[PDB]
Amino acid sequence: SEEIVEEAETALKALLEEAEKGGKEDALEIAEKLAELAKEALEVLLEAGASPELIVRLAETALKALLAIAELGGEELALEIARILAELAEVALEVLLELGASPELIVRLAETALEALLAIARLGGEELALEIARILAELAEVALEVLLELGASPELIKKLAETAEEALEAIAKLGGEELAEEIAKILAELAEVAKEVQKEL
Numbered sequence: 654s655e656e657i658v659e660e661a662e663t664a665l666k667a668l669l670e671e672a673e674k675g676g677k678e679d680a681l682e683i684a685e686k687l688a689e690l691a692k693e694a695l696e697v698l699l700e701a702g703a704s705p706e707l708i709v710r711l712a713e714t715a716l717k718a719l720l721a722i723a724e725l726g727g728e729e730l731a732l733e734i735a736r737i738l739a740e741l742a743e744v745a746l747e748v749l750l751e752l753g754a755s756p757e758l759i760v761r762l763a764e765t766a767l768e769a770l771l772a773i774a775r776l777g778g779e780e781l782a783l784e785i786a787r788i789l790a791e792l793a794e795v796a797l798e799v800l801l802e803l804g805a806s807p808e809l810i811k812k813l814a815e816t817a818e819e820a821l822e823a824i825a826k827l828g829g830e831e832l833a834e835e836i837a838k839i840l841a842e843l844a845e846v847a848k849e850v851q852k853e854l
Contacts, residue, residue: 654703661694662714669718677726684722684734688741691715695748705754712745713765720769724776731777735770735785739792742766746799756805760813763796771820779828783835786824790839793817794846801850810854814847 665687672683691711698708716738723734742762749759767789774785793813800810818840825836 654698654701655707657694657697657701657703658707658711661691661711664690665715665718669721672722673725677730680722680726681730681733684719684730684737687715687718687722688737692741692744695745699748699751702752705749705752705758708745708749708752708754709758709762712742712762715741716766716769720772723773728777728781731773732781732784735773735788738766738769738773739788742792743795746796750799750802753803756800756803756809759796759799759803759805760809760816763793763813764816766792767817767820771823774824774827779832782824782827783832786821786832786836786839789817789820789824790843793820793843797846797850801853805854807851807854810847810850814843814850817843 668683668687668690672680672687675683691714694711695708698711719734719738719741723731723738726734745762746759749762770785770789770792774782774789777785793816796813797810800813821836821840821843825833
C-alpha cells in the first residue's frame, strides 16, 4: 500500500522532470501520461484498502505536478492540463468516497484541486478564465455531492462551498464584463447545489 505510493510518486516526479526538460510540445503527452499513471495507481490503492491519507498524498502529488507543467507551459497548455487536473481530482474524490474517507480529507483534496485551478486561471488570459471557472464549478459541485454521501458536517460543506465561492469571485476580478456576467450564473449554479446539500443534512 505505502510502497505503491512510493513507486507511483517516483514515476510522477520522473515524468515531471522530462516535461520540464522537453519543450511544451511533449509536455502535454507527459501530462496525460502522468495523470493516467496516477489514476491507475489510485485504483490499485482502492482495491488494496489503503488509508485515505495515502490516496490524498498520491492525488495531491499528481495535482501539483500537473500544475507545475501548466505553469511552465503556455496559455493553451494551461487550459488543457486544467481539464486533466479536474478529471484526475474527480476520480480521486470518488475513490475517497468508496473508502469512506473522513470528510476533512475530501475538503482537503478539493481545496487543493480548486486552488490549482485558481492559479492556472490567474496565469491565463480572459477567455482562459471563463473555462476554468466552469471547470472549477463542476469540480466543486462534485465534491459537494461526495460530502453529501459521507454525512459530512454543515461547516465542512459551508467551508468547501465558500472556498469555491471566493475562488470564482477571484476569477471575476480577473476579466472584463462578459466574464463577470458569466461568473454570476456560475455562482448561482454552485450556490444552488450547496443549497440542496445543506438541505439534506
